[PDB]
Amino acid sequence: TQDLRSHLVHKLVQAIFPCPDPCALKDRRMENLVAYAKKVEGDMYESANSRDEYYHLLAEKIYKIQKELEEKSQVRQNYHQDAEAAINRQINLELYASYVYLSMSCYFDRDDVALKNFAKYFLHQSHEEREHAEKLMKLQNQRGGRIFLQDIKKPDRDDWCSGLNAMESALHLEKSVNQSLLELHKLATDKNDPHLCDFIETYYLSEQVKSIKELGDHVTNLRKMGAPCAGMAEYLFDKHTLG
Amino acid sequence: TQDLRSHLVHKLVQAIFPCPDPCALKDRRMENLVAYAKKVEGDMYESANSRDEYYHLLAEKIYKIQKELEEKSQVRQNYHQDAEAAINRQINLELYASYVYLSMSCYFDRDDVALKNFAKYFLHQSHEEREHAEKLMKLQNQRGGRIFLQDIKKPDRDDWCSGLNAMESALHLEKSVNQSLLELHKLATDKNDPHLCDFIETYYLSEQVKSIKELGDHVTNLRKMGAPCAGMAEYLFDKHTLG
Amino acid sequence: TQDLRSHLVHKLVQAIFPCPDPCALKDRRMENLVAYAKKVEGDMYESANSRDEYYHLLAEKIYKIQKELEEKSQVRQNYHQDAEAAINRQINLELYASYVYLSMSCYFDRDDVALKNFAKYFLHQSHEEREHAEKLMKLQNQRGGRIFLQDIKKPDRDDWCSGLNAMESALHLEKSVNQSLLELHKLATDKNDPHLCDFIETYYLSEQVKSIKELGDHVTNLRKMGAPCAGMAEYLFDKHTLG
Amino acid sequence: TQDLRSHLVHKLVQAIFPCPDPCALKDRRMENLVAYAKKVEGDMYESANSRDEYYHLLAEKIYKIQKELEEKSQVRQNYHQDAEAAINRQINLELYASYVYLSMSCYFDRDDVALKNFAKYFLHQSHEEREHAEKLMKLQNQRGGRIFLQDIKKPDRDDWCSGLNAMESALHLEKSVNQSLLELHKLATDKNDPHLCDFIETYYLSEQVKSIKELGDHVTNLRKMGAPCAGMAEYLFDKHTLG
Amino acid sequence: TQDLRSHLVHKLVQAIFPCPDPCALKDRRMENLVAYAKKVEGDMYESANSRDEYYHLLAEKIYKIQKELEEKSQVRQNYHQDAEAAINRQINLELYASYVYLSMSCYFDRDDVALKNFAKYFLHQSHEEREHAEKLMKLQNQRGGRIFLQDIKKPDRDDWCSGLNAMESALHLEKSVNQSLLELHKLATDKNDPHLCDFIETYYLSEQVKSIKELGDHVTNLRKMGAPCAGMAEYLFDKHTLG
Structure with a gap:
């Protein structure tokens, strides 16, 4: 004990x-x-x-x-703790998204699915999420702020079965990430943070919007060809779109 | 007021x-x-x-x-006002066709359709229509004639839904353009205009006939594979013909 | 009837x-x-x-x-109808500006003017306006919004006579476009739209400000050399600046 | 007299x-x-x-x-005098920073210091400040605003002795420049100036933050190796970091 | 207080x-x-x-x-304080000339002037003045002498209007710089300073004489074509000499 x-x-x-x-x-x-x-x-x-x-x-x-007397920082100028907490939550969400994308890439690469193009696309998305998380960490370090790394949560779904459910989960995750980015932008605007606001709206939204549009196009294509009630439609979308 | x-x-x-x-x-x-x-x-x-x-x-x-006393022109020789009005109507029809093709390219590029090859083909067709309209304007300017630019009408259909209706609309538009070109040729022949007749029958019909033939082939392919009652047929025609 | x-x-x-x-x-x-x-x-x-x-x-x-029950969209997140109407009005203004620039390029390319460099510059400006309009349409399609294409209005002036009046009209048109962009930015800020605001202030104003500055420099050069009461000044500005 | x-x-x-x-x-x-x-x-x-x-x-x-009746300008649209005064003060501060960096580069290049890498780094920083000042002047000229060039103040410190005091002075100067940029951004936001705000937050802060971070890293390295009570630490930082 | x-x-x-x-x-x-x-x-x-x-x-x-007991220097050999004061005054005059040339380059680059070649020439002249000032500072540092940087004075004229007044001001400034160089040479000769005399008469006068000759040629060309009472003459001199 x-x-x-x-x-x-x-x-x-x-x-x-x-x-x-x-x-x-x-x-x-x-x-x-x-x-x-x-x-x-x-x-x-x-x-x-x-x-x-x-x-x-x-x-x-x-x-x-x-948060006692650590001399604050040497490069930190005008930065409230609410923005730091928002950046920490955004980094945690980015890590969770990277973990979910890694799980998706490893699930479609198994023997019961046999989809290499989807696995490669999910691995590329996980790499992009990892790079975005590293960029956020570097930006937080350059602003003189502490990074409180918590515990990365596990994906709630492990058996994706087909591909439509995985696409819906990815779309919901991207929508949640976009909502978190909008909340971070609003908090930075209400707390006077022009640099972080500009950086988030420039070097992050330009890729998130494109990813959301691509996922929406993929969902629209899957919901018209015959998926999930069409085994040939999945193979066609695999050996053409992501192939 | x-x-x-x-x-x-x-x-x-x-x-x-x-x-x-x-x-x-x-x-x-x-x-x-x-x-x-x-x-x-x-x-x-x-x-x-x-x-x-x-x-x-x-x-x-x-x-x-x-049309009072503007000294006519310095390069205008043997050209009736009927031919000028016909050229103006043809230019207006070319602009309307370019606008319709732009609308088609922007509709298939949305999220509820997700067809990039069709959008690229419609954008190329719109660019070709724009180049043909500019060439007609330059030819009218070289003949010493006035250009009366009216108001470009909006497309009557905005929701193309599938792809067969868009192909039928494009075929009808090409047939109308061909009929207008035939009327212009007949008017130029009845009013003694060999240069404009030759230019229209050489540097315009050679592309319009090919475009009509390609649209007819596309419609024939769509009306045999299973469209619009076959979601996989559209993807096959997208990732092979225009891909 | x-x-x-x-x-x-x-x-x-x-x-x-x-x-x-x-x-x-x-x-x-x-x-x-x-x-x-x-x-x-x-x-x-x-x-x-x-x-x-x-x-x-x-x-x-x-x-x-x-605007009944069209399931809104799949990628539309936090977007009011006022911003959509503003984007539609901006697209209409871009199309009108492209039409005016095309008319200017076709007027200076005639026989009563004989100015090829001005025609080429106006054609390049019309191409830039067309590309900006297509980019706005693509951005609106990526945000899950409807595009209501109205009727393109005709230019109020057809006989530009010299070149100073055309430059003044182009400057007024650019000022109107800048005012419309400022109104769109204000509406997006008041309705919480950071992505559209950043996109407009980044990938649009950087070119509009340069175009306004170039047109102002051209007007200043024309209003000092002797135009419009100096026929040689127009030829000098043609065979040097835009040549 | x-x-x-x-x-x-x-x-x-x-x-x-x-x-x-x-x-x-x-x-x-x-x-x-x-x-x-x-x-x-x-x-x-x-x-x-x-x-x-x-x-x-x-x-x-x-x-x-x-400010009587100079016809304002031909490209000036929506721009208050407070923003012009803020831009003038920012340009004056940029010129003062360039002068201070030139003095630092010329002091370390003497015979009583003998530090070529520090002199080259300070000369590069002075060149960057000069380029930023020229860019600000060009941006003010493109917006149709007057530039009131005042008298450039002399550096208050001429004998930098070691290198730690120079680094502290450079860090304080960069912090003052960042505070001035934040004040300019706040004034442009309160006076409705989206273009200038975006330009300042994009093509200026991205370099100022990196410069502040680099100066902070240099100060942290100097305050750990043994400076100023370690003559070998300065030579090591000279022949490795800036060498 | x-x-x-x-x-x-x-x-x-x-x-x-x-x-x-x-x-x-x-x-x-x-x-x-x-x-x-x-x-x-x-x-x-x-x-x-x-x-x-x-x-x-x-x-x-x-x-x-x-000037108490700073152990003079380690490389200073035979150098009176009068020569040091003359070098300081020459450096101040070089900085003032660079500031005036920068102001001229930024004035002609505005919207009310629209002269890019003159702006580029003035920017090149300002860069040359800056390089000459840096070379003078380096030469003074190599001789073991102190540099007393004072306050850079502002240009007395801000509105250059045309181009002839700017050329006259530049010619007067170059004549003042030449007179200062002659006074420095005379002081170095009367105080026995062969190295500084040779350096000034070799690596400085060879460029100053050419600059004075070029400015005189420009003034002579402007005072014959019709300037300032000829708007086309300025454009011709812009799009040929400095173009």
Whole structure:
């Protein structure tokens, strides 16, 4: 009953003093801070009541202590925490979309589907999502902001069966990404952020709109040839459009 | 409603004296002409009766004052006004055909159709119609004739739905263009115009006949594969014929 | 008159049911709808009073019935009808500008003017306007919006005489286009449309500002050399600037 | 000596009538205007009180007479004087930054410093600032606006000693330039100027953010290797980063 | 009311001790020096009388204290302060000429002038002046001399109207530059400076004489064709000489 306890206590004691630099002081202040954090954790667990609210309070405490006196940054100029949280959520959504596209590329590449062009297209889309996520991370690093990488969620659907359901899921994901981008643009406009707004509306929407249009065209073509009730239509769309 | 009155009176006062050259006389004769035209318009409107006949009489007056003493031309030799009117009608029909082809290219390029090859073919046809119209305009300018550009009419059909109706409309439009060209040839033969007749029968019919034959072949192929009751036939004709 | 009656009744009966698909039901519901529309037209013509208000009411009815339950679109996300109407008006203005530039190119290419460089420049400007109009149409199609192509108006001036009046008309047309673009930008900003705003301010204004500056420079050069009271100045500006 | 009096009176008499065109009238109206301006200056100097307020009133009078009836411009459409003043201040700041970068490049190129890579980098930065200033001037000229070139201020620091102080000064200058650009963007947004806003946020911020990030990285590298208390660290950063 | 006081006191306290090196002593001697300078400024402001003479005395004190015991230089051999002041004045004149040429290039590039060849020529002349100024700065740095960058003065004329006045101003500026170069040569000859004399008479006069000759030829051509009373002459000189 101490493994999970050790894992949950080794987070705050590392978030408080993350750089144990031995090129200055000794290592007794670190031990004092560890003992103080252990006592605080003990008393707050004694004064607890449940388990989920305890984890929520721990997360809130970690988020509060990580914004104390870190000298802000050297290149950060006029940037609110709401824009940072929006960028973090957008990066998380980009990573989730890349994971979903990777799962789609690996599903159509199996033996029960046998569709190489769809797998290659989904792999290219996953690579584009990864490049967009890396570009967002680099832009956030250039603006002097922290990046809080959370846990990447797993795709809710693993068996795509045919191809129409996968196209509908991709279209819904692209619509959600577009809605998130619109919310980010609105938040940057309401919080005075011209550079991020211009960067998002220039080097991101120009590709997202084209991707949404291509997915809509693919769905329209699939919903007219005879899919999913036409096995030859899928082969024709495979050996011509993405082939 | 005086804005319409000003817009309808600013046409004749500009058609009478279209070149207010300040490198000679002053600007009192122009004012006298404007006052005379205003008085004429006033008395004619007081001696009117309806609205459509008034516009028809104004159009007839404009057409009759634009053929007064403009020294004809310096390169115009043996050319009747009937041939000029026929060339103007042919140019108007060419512009209408180009507009219809542009509308067809922009309709198939949407998201509810998703047909890129048909859109590219219609765009190429619109470009060919535009080049033919420009060539007709240049030929009319080289013969010393006036060009009366009217208003380009809008396509009567905006929702082409499938592709068979668009092909039938294009075939009917090409048949109408061929009939207009035959009427122009007959009028030029009856009015002694060998140069225009030869130019039309050489540098125009050779492409119109091929276009009509190609459209007929496309219609025959669509009316045998299973269109419009076959979604795969449209994709096959897209990814092979125009692809 | 019954030909005009047939032409005006064949619009609503085609706008109500535009896709007579024979791959499902028969053709008796279409006949019933045609009879109902004919009865409606008859009673509304019996309950009429004039002619212009009748056409206005018919246009309003057509515009109302074309926004019923067409499933909106598959790629349309956050887009008000005001922005669509503004895009339609901008496309109409672009087509009118292209027509005016074509008329200018064909006027200077005649025998009474003899200016090939001005004609080539006006033809290039008309081609640029056509490309911009096609790009606007493609952008509207990618956003899931309808395109209502109206009637292209004819140029109010046909005899440009010299070149200074043509330059002034082109400058006024460019100023009107810039004002329309500013109004479109303001409407997109007030209706929350970041993508269209960015696209218009990036891939359109960068060329419109340069065109306005070039036309202003040409007007300044013409209003200093001696035009229009200097025949050699026009030849010098032709065989150097646009030559 | 009347040197200063003549120098201060030769500015208003040249700002009132700046174009003594001899291709029209004679030269007696110019003499009358000069005499009137001399009488006005005499009476205003008799009704003066100090020296600094006199120069301020003269500057205000010059600024108010230079906005009388100059026909505005031929390409200026929707542009307030506040945006023009902001563009002038931005151009002045760009010129000051270019002068400071030139001074930095010439200081490190001396014999008491002996740093060629830093001098080359500062010269490249000065060239970039000069190109940005020329681009701003060209953009202001294309919008039909006046450019009021003031006096370029001298750098407050001439002896940069080491390299860390120069990097801190460059970082502060870049932060001031970014703040000025943000103020210009806010003023253009509050005064309805989409074209200038887009141009500034596209063709200027993309380089300013990268320059600020590079300067921050250089400062971070210098504040970790041992500078300024490490002579070898400067040589290592010279013969690797900028070498 | 203390902003100007702080700005004027932060000059001497920085000129006395310009290198606050923390790699040796502490920071109490700097505070003592600042307090002493503040007391000196206080007593000398109490013992003042006017404002302009106060600034002159401050400038003289700054110039005196900047020549105390800076170990002269390591490459400076036989070089009097008069030659250094002459080089500084020549550099200031070169910067002023570059600024005037930039203003001329930006004025002719506007919309009310429309002269691209003149603008390009003036930009090339400004680039040549900038290169000459950089070469002079590098030569002064190689001789072990200080460079006192003052404030660049603004051009006295902003509205050049035509082109003849601009050519006359450029000719007068080139004559002033030639006179300054002759004075510098005479001062270097009277103070025994063969290297600087040879460098100035070789790598500077060879271009200045050619520039003066070209400007004289341009003025002679403009004063014979009909300028400024001939609008076609300016266009001919633009589209042939500098075109």
